Amino acid sequence: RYLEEEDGPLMKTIKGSITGFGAGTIYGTILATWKDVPRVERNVALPGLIRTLKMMGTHGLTFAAIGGVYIGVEQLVQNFRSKRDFYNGAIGGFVAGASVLGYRARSIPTAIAAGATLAVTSALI
Amino acid sequence: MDLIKYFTFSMIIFILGIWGILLNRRNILIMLMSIELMLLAVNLNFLVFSVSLDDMMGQVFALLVLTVAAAESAIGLAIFVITFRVRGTIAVEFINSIQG
Amino acid sequence: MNTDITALEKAQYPVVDRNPAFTKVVGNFSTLDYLRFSTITGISVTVGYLSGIKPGIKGPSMVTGGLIGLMGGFMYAYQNSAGRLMGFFPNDGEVASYQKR
Amino acid sequence: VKVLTYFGMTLAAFAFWQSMDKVHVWIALHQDEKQERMEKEAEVRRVRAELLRKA
Amino acid sequence: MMLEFAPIFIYLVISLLVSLILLGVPFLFSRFDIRFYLVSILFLIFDLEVTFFFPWAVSLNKIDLFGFWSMMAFLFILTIGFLYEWKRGALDWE
Amino acid sequence: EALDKGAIEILGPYGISYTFRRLAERISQLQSGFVYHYAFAMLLGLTLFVTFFCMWDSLSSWVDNRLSFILIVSSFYTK
Amino acid sequence: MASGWGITGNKGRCYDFWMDFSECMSHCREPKDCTLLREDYLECLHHSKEFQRRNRIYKEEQRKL
Amino acid sequence: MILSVLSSLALVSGLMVVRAKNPVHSVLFFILVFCDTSGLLLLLGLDFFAMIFLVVYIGAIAVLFLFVVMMFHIQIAEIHEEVLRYLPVSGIIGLIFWWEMFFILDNESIPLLPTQRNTTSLRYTVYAGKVRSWTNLETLGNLLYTYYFVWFLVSSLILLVAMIGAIVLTMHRT
Amino acid sequence: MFNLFLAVFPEIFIINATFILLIHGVVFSTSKKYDYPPLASNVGWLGLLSVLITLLLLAAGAPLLTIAHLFWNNLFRRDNFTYFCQIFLLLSTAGTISMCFDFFDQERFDAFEFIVLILLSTCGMLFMISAYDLIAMYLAIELQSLCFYVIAASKRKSEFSTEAGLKYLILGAFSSGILLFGCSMIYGSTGATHFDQLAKILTGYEITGARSSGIFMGILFIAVGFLFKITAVPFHMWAPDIYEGSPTPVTAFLSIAPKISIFANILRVFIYGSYGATLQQIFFFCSIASMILGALAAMAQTKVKRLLAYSSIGHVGYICIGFSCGTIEGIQSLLIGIFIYALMTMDAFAIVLALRQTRVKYIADLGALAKTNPILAITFSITMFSYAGIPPLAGFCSKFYLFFAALGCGAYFLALVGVVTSVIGCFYYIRLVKRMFFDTPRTWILYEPMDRNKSLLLAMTSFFITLFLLYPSPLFSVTHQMALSLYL
């Protein structure tokens, strides 16, 4: 069922960071487009584009950090311990969630909640 | 390469309708016109395919879709008129009361 | 215009006439058919009268309701008569009159 | 817009459509590599499911 | 054949040129009326009626009685619409 | 205090009501009352359908299914 | 071209192929039994294999030049 | 080449429909997109549809749009917005739709590449079809009112609804 | 020749009766002699009679609706599935009409054209059910949609009604254009629009490596249009705004009949055509999104109409779970869920229309209703517990299936979503029971008693809701019949 791949832990981490950046760029574009423009900005176009691109870059960065650290810690767990399970990975989701989303939200309870949610989500898979 | 060129003509009109929706969040009249551009592109698709397949069903449906497009435009502009008459303006900030 | 009366589900009763003419189906109207016709028409006239009192048009409303009922009752009676002649409905009397004439 | 602006946008669109013609010819020229790659991926799946049922 | 449309195009170009010569030689020396919407709607409906008549009129010799009566039913529906519009005062401009 | 009216409440009825009230508040704000947002949502759904159910043949080279769902849930902890 | 009505007032170019495929499928309880007729109909619709073969010829001509 | 000219005219005219500041100009550019479509239909040999697109889209529908838009006297402030910020989202959406749909036929309808050989000599002519040829008009009229008459009548019902709804929504009798 | 039209007798009758009513209304509403009488209730009673006569003609002519099936084949297809679907649609329309007379008389909504447009849309949905070709399907869908656009804007001086109509026209025309683009792709790729031809072309292959992308995207776009029609997330945001902004009898009608007709279309198009997995995954993912989003958004609502709109979105999610599984029991359960949701919604909107005489708007307006009208508070509590799926009320039946398919098609994430969203739904439904029974407000609203039509309809639907699980055999048998008749 899974016998179509070539793997490579470093390649896995790089590709995951790249995919995370792409998804974060798409998400940032969507969020920037949903929002209205500040009233002081309705009559001038360029600052709106700058804010859209800034949102794109910031979301690409945070999503790339999550999508990289998740699999990086997943392999660095399954490499040293060298056991394949859903446990290996629950730790990666937790550390990605905690670190990145707590650096972003600046809150420790938010870090714990985000890591827990990512842990359950990666556990189901 | 004839079929691909006619097809891309119609496809560009369809994409222009989509972009016109995307680009006119303050202009609801242009949104209605973008929808009419999409409908025109679909009609073209049916006619081109009818020719390409030597089949008449694409032409029958093109005529009927014409009737539908006319009816849609008449009703759409009637609703636009009563919306404007009630509010005095067409600005999108006056048609956002229903929410949640 | 090419036509084909053939139904998806075959008639379960003796087929007296596959495609009976309009006047033949009308002439096949039975006592029960006229009872259905009259009941539908009378109910429709009554509804027209009763719903017309408040706007003040009970007479014209009566005529309108009666027209709707006349069309619906005639269509229902025709439906039953033609179904009997075609074998789709139980058609004892149709077969008894057919086996004799 | 100015009339010259409409003319210039038309020229640019004409160039875009000729570029699309080149893209279509490129896609038409690579039908055989698509077919040969598809030969492999479908046959790999066959040799695969056949081997997976030998046990 | 579509060959006969090419002279129409060349004719259009020449008409354009004549228009510009005539127009250019001298450069050398808040109240919405719903009745216009209503007339537009009526025109659109009957425009579609003329459109559906064009194939019918050229095809009458093949469609025979079936085609005639289907067009009559079509007209009957649209004429009921017309009578509705008439009784509602959409045809009055005073 | 620490268990019955503490952690059990927080990891139970008291916390569950809080988080679901915030989730309901946020989901309600999506229905913004702007027709442009409804068309944008329809267009995004169309684009998402096309992308996932047709353009998902060569992506599996660079992506994994695990990452995808991870990022969707992680989007909830933004701003 | 499954309806039969051609755009110039005659039988459609691909109607006979459609009818062959349909008549085969009406009694063959397995769709794979009518695969050849199905791809005949679709080939009539789009001329994919014919044009692919002619493009092969053109490509070989360009290669030998 | 000719298809490239018509495609370019339609592309510019459509951009002007969706990007003009003034909605009256937008309706006028829409008339140009319909004229170009009529030209394409003439190329396909469908002269009835080419004329009907002129009669219905331009002669009747665009007129209604023009009457309504002109009498509305829309002010540019009520509908103005800067569109530079939408270049990325337009880019992604349009690029996905482009890469996926401008090339949807390519696998199914492979183009015949033009060679340096006269392939016109292999056109086979069948004269039997040419004895009494049918126009687009009579070919369509052979079907509309007999084999497919129910859809014709349903379209009449659609038109009736349009007339009723127009009267009911807007009529204020003097 | 005349006997061929026996297959279209119900439609012929209803269309001609609609014309008669249009003429009668316009002639006597303009009459100075009768002082321009309001004719909305008169034409309403005559139209209800017309619907009941149409129902008589259709149900008593079951074998005759299949006469001349080859002559009528290129236009429509009448079978047992269509027979029962059309009977149910006519019953829904009759109930909805009977629920409107108090609204006509007390608000003085005098426009009889309201009834005419409802009847014309009923014709359109009748043609939708028997549609057997993409062309006919689209035409019938457009007729129904245009009637709804016009009736959504019927209160033409109200800001809310004009706003509802405008959003409906734009989002509805957009979705219709998307669906029409899908039909064009399918036609171009297969040269066929008839459902039988599409069946033959597409069966046996699905995605056989060399998949026609044209067919696949035609299917995707048609599916997007259908999902807009059934208010599945993420194509749903038009529904709560239009449901609120439209006049309440319009909201009641839009809640039931279009769903019956569009689900008939979805069955006959997808279950019958053959692209397979992707089509069902579409509906699987949209069902999950609908359940979650409907539950949360309903939990956030403070107005009765919005709560009902979001509840309907959640329930279509539950129903579409049945279409996702793609088995005989899936179709049967979809049909059972549709029937029970329709009866429950008719109950709920009968109560809402009864309370609209004193202008109910907020959930808090129902405070102390168990004192001012105890039997109405019990009837409404029964409806809310039925909506929540508490056994042995009829609402349990649909909930039971959700978990039956989740453990049948082997899907435990679906099961978990169902458990959580069921709990959330139970909460926001029992909040209304708390408001009517447990609260002691300082200011009470006294409500006018309802008319006879709504009391009789409410009594019957409430008896059904409490007592269906005692004698559920006929619905089970008839839905099994319909599920089988989809293929044979």
mmCIF file with all atom_site columns, N, CA and C in Angstrom, chain B residues 3-28:
data_model
loop_
_atom_site.group_PDB
_atom_site.id
_atom_site.type_symbol
_atom_site.label_atom_id
_atom_site.label_alt_id
_atom_site.label_comp_id
_atom_site.label_asym_id
_atom_site.label_entity_id
_atom_site.label_seq_id
_atom_site.pdbx_PDB_ins_code
_atom_site.Cartn_x
_atom_site.Cartn_y
_atom_site.Cartn_z
_atom_site.occupancy
_atom_site.B_iso_or_equiv
_atom_site.pdbx_formal_charge
_atom_site.auth_seq_id
_atom_site.auth_comp_id
_atom_site.auth_asym_id
_atom_site.auth_atom_id
_atom_site.pdbx_PDB_model_num
ATOM 1  N N  . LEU B 1 3  ? -9.633  23.242 -33.494 1.00 0.00 ? 3  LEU B N  1
ATOM 2  C CA . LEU B 1 3  ? -10.495 23.016 -32.341 1.00 0.00 ? 3  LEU B CA 1
ATOM 3  C C  . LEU B 1 3  ? -9.902  23.619 -31.075 1.00 0.00 ? 3  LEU B C  1
ATOM 4  N N  . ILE B 1 4  ? -8.587  23.485 -30.888 1.00 0.00 ? 4  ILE B N  1
ATOM 5  C CA . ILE B 1 4  ? -7.954  24.039 -29.696 1.00 0.00 ? 4  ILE B CA 1
ATOM 6  C C  . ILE B 1 4  ? -8.055  25.561 -29.685 1.00 0.00 ? 4  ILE B C  1
ATOM 7  N N  . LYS B 1 5  ? -7.984  26.195 -30.858 1.00 0.00 ? 5  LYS B N  1
ATOM 8  C CA . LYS B 1 5  ? -7.998  27.657 -30.904 1.00 0.00 ? 5  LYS B CA 1
ATOM 9  C C  . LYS B 1 5  ? -9.383  28.219 -30.580 1.00 0.00 ? 5  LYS B C  1
ATOM 10 N N  . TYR B 1 6  ? -10.434 27.647 -31.178 1.00 0.00 ? 6  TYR B N  1
ATOM 11 C CA . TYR B 1 6  ? -11.798 28.033 -30.819 1.00 0.00 ? 6  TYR B CA 1
ATOM 12 C C  . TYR B 1 6  ? -12.063 27.775 -29.342 1.00 0.00 ? 6  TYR B C  1
ATOM 13 N N  . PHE B 1 7  ? -11.634 26.606 -28.882 1.00 0.00 ? 7  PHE B N  1
ATOM 14 C CA . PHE B 1 7  ? -11.836 26.269 -27.454 1.00 0.00 ? 7  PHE B CA 1
ATOM 15 C C  . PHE B 1 7  ? -11.151 27.317 -26.566 1.00 0.00 ? 7  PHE B C  1
ATOM 16 N N  . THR B 1 8  ? -9.915  27.707 -26.874 1.00 0.00 ? 8  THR B N  1
ATOM 17 C CA . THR B 1 8  ? -9.229  28.661 -26.007 1.00 0.00 ? 8  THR B CA 1
ATOM 18 C C  . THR B 1 8  ? -9.846  30.048 -26.092 1.00 0.00 ? 8  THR B C  1
ATOM 19 N N  . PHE B 1 9  ? -10.425 30.409 -27.236 1.00 0.00 ? 9  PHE B N  1
ATOM 20 C CA . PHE B 1 9  ? -11.225 31.628 -27.306 1.00 0.00 ? 9  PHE B CA 1
ATOM 21 C C  . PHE B 1 9  ? -12.337 31.609 -26.255 1.00 0.00 ? 9  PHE B C  1
ATOM 22 N N  . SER B 1 10 ? -13.140 30.543 -26.271 1.00 0.00 ? 10 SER B N  1
ATOM 23 C CA . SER B 1 10 ? -14.220 30.447 -25.292 1.00 0.00 ? 10 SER B CA 1
ATOM 24 C C  . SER B 1 10 ? -13.679 30.383 -23.866 1.00 0.00 ? 10 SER B C  1
ATOM 25 N N  . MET B 1 11 ? -12.575 29.664 -23.666 1.00 0.00 ? 11 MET B N  1
ATOM 26 C CA . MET B 1 11 ? -12.002 29.532 -22.335 1.00 0.00 ? 11 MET B CA 1
ATOM 27 C C  . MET B 1 11 ? -11.515 30.870 -21.802 1.00 0.00 ? 11 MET B C  1
ATOM 28 N N  . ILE B 1 12 ? -10.904 31.695 -22.655 1.00 0.00 ? 12 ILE B N  1
ATOM 29 C CA . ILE B 1 12 ? -10.480 33.013 -22.201 1.00 0.00 ? 12 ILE B CA 1
ATOM 30 C C  . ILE B 1 12 ? -11.684 33.848 -21.803 1.00 0.00 ? 12 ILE B C  1
ATOM 31 N N  . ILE B 1 13 ? -12.805 33.733 -22.522 1.00 0.00 ? 13 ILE B N  1
ATOM 32 C CA . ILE B 1 13 ? -13.972 34.505 -22.088 1.00 0.00 ? 13 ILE B CA 1
ATOM 33 C C  . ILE B 1 13 ? -14.449 34.028 -20.715 1.00 0.00 ? 13 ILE B C  1
ATOM 34 N N  . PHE B 1 14 ? -14.452 32.711 -20.499 1.00 0.00 ? 14 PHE B N  1
ATOM 35 C CA . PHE B 1 14 ? -14.875 32.172 -19.207 1.00 0.00 ? 14 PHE B CA 1
ATOM 36 C C  . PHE B 1 14 ? -13.967 32.657 -18.075 1.00 0.00 ? 14 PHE B C  1
ATOM 37 N N  . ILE B 1 15 ? -12.654 32.631 -18.307 1.00 0.00 ? 15 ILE B N  1
ATOM 38 C CA . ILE B 1 15 ? -11.708 33.081 -17.289 1.00 0.00 ? 15 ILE B CA 1
ATOM 39 C C  . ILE B 1 15 ? -11.871 34.572 -17.035 1.00 0.00 ? 15 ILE B C  1
ATOM 40 N N  . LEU B 1 16 ? -12.184 35.337 -18.082 1.00 0.00 ? 16 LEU B N  1
ATOM 41 C CA . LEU B 1 16 ? -12.416 36.765 -17.906 1.00 0.00 ? 16 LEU B CA 1
ATOM 42 C C  . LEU B 1 16 ? -13.635 37.017 -17.033 1.00 0.00 ? 16 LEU B C  1
ATOM 43 N N  . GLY B 1 17 ? -14.683 36.210 -17.197 1.00 0.00 ? 17 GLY B N  1
ATOM 44 C CA . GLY B 1 17 ? -15.810 36.298 -16.279 1.00 0.00 ? 17 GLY B CA 1
ATOM 45 C C  . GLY B 1 17 ? -15.414 36.009 -14.839 1.00 0.00 ? 17 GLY B C  1
ATOM 46 N N  . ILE B 1 18 ? -14.607 34.964 -14.633 1.00 0.00 ? 18 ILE B N  1
ATOM 47 C CA . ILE B 1 18 ? -14.160 34.626 -13.277 1.00 0.00 ? 18 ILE B CA 1
ATOM 48 C C  . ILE B 1 18 ? -13.350 35.772 -12.671 1.00 0.00 ? 18 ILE B C  1
ATOM 49 N N  . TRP B 1 19 ? -12.405 36.313 -13.444 1.00 0.00 ? 19 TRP B N  1
ATOM 50 C CA . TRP B 1 19 ? -11.607 37.440 -12.971 1.00 0.00 ? 19 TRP B CA 1
ATOM 51 C C  . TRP B 1 19 ? -12.479 38.651 -12.690 1.00 0.00 ? 19 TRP B C  1
ATOM 52 N N  . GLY B 1 20 ? -13.500 38.873 -13.516 1.00 0.00 ? 20 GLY B N  1
ATOM 53 C CA . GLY B 1 20 ? -14.375 40.011 -13.307 1.00 0.00 ? 20 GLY B CA 1
ATOM 54 C C  . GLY B 1 20 ? -15.163 39.897 -12.021 1.00 0.00 ? 20 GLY B C  1
ATOM 55 N N  . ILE B 1 21 ? -15.539 38.674 -11.651 1.00 0.00 ? 21 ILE B N  1
ATOM 56 C CA . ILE B 1 21 ? -16.074 38.454 -10.309 1.00 0.00 ? 21 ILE B CA 1
ATOM 57 C C  . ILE B 1 21 ? -15.020 38.808 -9.265  1.00 0.00 ? 21 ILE B C  1
ATOM 58 N N  . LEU B 1 22 ? -13.797 38.311 -9.461  1.00 0.00 ? 22 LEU B N  1
ATOM 59 C CA . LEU B 1 22 ? -12.749 38.454 -8.454  1.00 0.00 ? 22 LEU B CA 1
ATOM 60 C C  . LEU B 1 22 ? -12.337 39.911 -8.248  1.00 0.00 ? 22 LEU B C  1
ATOM 61 N N  . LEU B 1 23 ? -12.508 40.748 -9.266  1.00 0.00 ? 23 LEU B N  1
ATOM 62 C CA . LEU B 1 23 ? -11.906 42.073 -9.322  1.00 0.00 ? 23 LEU B CA 1
ATOM 63 C C  . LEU B 1 23 ? -12.888 43.211 -9.079  1.00 0.00 ? 23 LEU B C  1
ATOM 64 N N  . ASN B 1 24 ? -14.144 42.917 -8.766  1.00 0.00 ? 24 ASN B N  1
ATOM 65 C CA . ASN B 1 24 ? -15.161 43.961 -8.709  1.00 0.00 ? 24 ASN B CA 1
ATOM 66 C C  . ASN B 1 24 ? -15.978 43.901 -7.427  1.00 0.00 ? 24 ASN B C  1
ATOM 67 N N  . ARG B 1 25 ? -15.316 43.859 -6.268  1.00 0.00 ? 25 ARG B N  1
ATOM 68 C CA . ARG B 1 25 ? -16.044 43.613 -5.025  1.00 0.00 ? 25 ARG B CA 1
ATOM 69 C C  . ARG B 1 25 ? -16.907 44.797 -4.613  1.00 0.00 ? 25 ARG B C  1
ATOM 70 N N  . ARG B 1 26 ? -16.708 45.957 -5.228  1.00 0.00 ? 26 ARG B N  1
ATOM 71 C CA . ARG B 1 26 ? -17.536 47.126 -4.978  1.00 0.00 ? 26 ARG B CA 1
ATOM 72 C C  . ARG B 1 26 ? -18.528 47.376 -6.096  1.00 0.00 ? 26 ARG B C  1
ATOM 73 N N  . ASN B 1 27 ? -18.465 46.591 -7.165  1.00 0.00 ? 27 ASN B N  1
ATOM 74 C CA . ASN B 1 27 ? -19.215 46.847 -8.389  1.00 0.00 ? 27 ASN B CA 1
ATOM 75 C C  . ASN B 1 27 ? -19.997 45.591 -8.746  1.00 0.00 ? 27 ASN B C  1
ATOM 76 N N  . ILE B 1 28 ? -21.243 45.577 -8.267  1.00 0.00 ? 28 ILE B N  1
ATOM 77 C CA . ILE B 1 28 ? -22.119 44.379 -8.420  1.00 0.00 ? 28 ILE B CA 1
ATOM 78 C C  . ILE B 1 28 ? -22.737 44.333 -9.816  1.00 0.00 ? 28 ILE B C  1
#
